[PDB]
Amino acid sequence: QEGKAVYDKACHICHSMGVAGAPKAHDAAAWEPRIAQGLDTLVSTVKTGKGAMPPGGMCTDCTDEDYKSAIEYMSK
Numbered sequence: 001q002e003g004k005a006v007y008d009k010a011c012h013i014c015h016s017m018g019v020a021g022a023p024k025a026h027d028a029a030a031w032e033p034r035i036a037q038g039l040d041t042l043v044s045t046v047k048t049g050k051g052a053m054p055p056g057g058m059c060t061d062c063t064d065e066d067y068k069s070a071i072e073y074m075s076k
């Protein structure tokens with residue numbers, strides 16, 4: 001899947017406005033410290049969930065590649 005496609009059907013729900021502290025999409029400054037953790041780490045976190053974010057980020061068919069693509073789209 002394309003990163004933007006994953007975002008538009010799932011991630012945008014909370015990340016478009018940065019609800020409950022979600023790093024806002026296309027906010028490079030907000031995503032920089034999170035990207036710095038390493039993509040492997042971020043993909044793992046999305047799949048297990050983190051606080052207010054539910055495991056999977058409401059994508060029902062996402063591969064690790066899909067998750068990574070989605071993060072890359074949001075991070076700029």
Ligand code: HEC
Pocket residue numbers: 006007010011012013014015019020021022023034037042043045046050051052053054056057058059062067070071
């Ligand atoms: C609301 C129900 C969310 C949906 C749907 C998605 N995300 Fe999320 N995400 C959400 C919150 C509230 C937060 C902040 C959590 C915190 O306590 O900091 C996040 C954070 C992320 C992160 C950063 C995790 C980290 O280690 O700091 C990533 C990488 C992330 N979200 C990715 C992501 C993707 C790819 C999604 C779509 C598939 C997605 N999120 C959906 C809330 C919500």
